[PDB]
Design a protein around this ligand. Sequence first.
Ligand SMILES: *[C@@H]1O[C@H](CO)[C@@H](O)[C@H](O)[C@H]1NC(C)=O
Lengths: 176, 187
Amino acid sequence: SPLPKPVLDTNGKELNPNSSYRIISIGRGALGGDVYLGKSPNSDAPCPDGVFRYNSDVGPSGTPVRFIPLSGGIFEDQLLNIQFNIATVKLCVSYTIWKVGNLNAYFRTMLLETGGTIGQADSSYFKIVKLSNFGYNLLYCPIDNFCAKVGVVIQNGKRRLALVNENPLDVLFQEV
Amino acid sequence: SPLPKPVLDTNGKELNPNSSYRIISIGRGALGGDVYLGKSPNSDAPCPDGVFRYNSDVGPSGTPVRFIPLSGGIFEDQLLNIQFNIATVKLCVSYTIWKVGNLNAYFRTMLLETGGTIGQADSSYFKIVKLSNFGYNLLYCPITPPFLCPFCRDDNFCAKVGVVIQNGKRRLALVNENPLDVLFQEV
Ligand SMILES: *[C@@H]1O[C@H](CO)[C@@H](O)[C@H](O)[C@H]1NC(C)=O
């Protein structure tokens, strides 16, 4: 019985819902590459709708996000929505909001997408956990409580975030 | 346009339409204060609609913006729209986009607001220029006749963007003199 612990950014500050963070990797160079909003393949969607991370961190920085906790603050092991915190055209507002996709028969998993909703019964909820001595992991939780770890599959040469069983993605939160 | 000059951020790097910048003050201390999206008192907008700067740089950092040229890249003396680069609800998307308000007969000028459009005939276009030899200034540049604008004189009827004190807050606004001197810090 430990009690709720705050998530901390790379500066050691508690995550604030009114701030923006890049989700960066544990690794540097070739193992680096921040999370970003990109275009998927075989995607009907009118807007960018894939959640990816870069193939190395020697290039662009990630797309910032905010965390919308269901009730109150950003704490470990607590449900929240995640949304890329940038301006889009009216059409694409939905497509900043993280969502888990339909089970993809080739990968035999669900890939992370955008196009969901904030704070509803149909929304995709995630939690931030410390499964490790350094950094955090993201889990997807429907409706401990039957969650799934987020990691990466390789899709058209890109790092596509997806649900996995082993090697989840280790991340830190870098205030923007 | 004696060869076209890209606008540079605080690292000397050319500004890009797909990055975000904070608009920061140039002076530090009490002269400091980044641009932010704030709630206007005396506005019935359904979302915050005021372009302000903080009263010193000890407070929060500014609301990031992106620059959206009418055409092409980001260059000095070239028309662009400006938008605070943040997620909002659908009804509030407009209120990330910079525009010039109507004549405020009390301040005897127009206040900078959000509520605008991007890349249309009705959009509020601005330019990034170099008046003083350190940092940049913003101008508002009417693309139709500014019947209503007191300070739309300069050259092409462009007006200097500066600051007025509204409920003890620095509110951006068209000024006759003392333009706001700004640097762009990549987010
Ligand atoms: C910004 O926009 C260009 C437009 O083609 C795109 O290739 C790129 O992702 C971005 N980066 C740079 C450095 O231009």
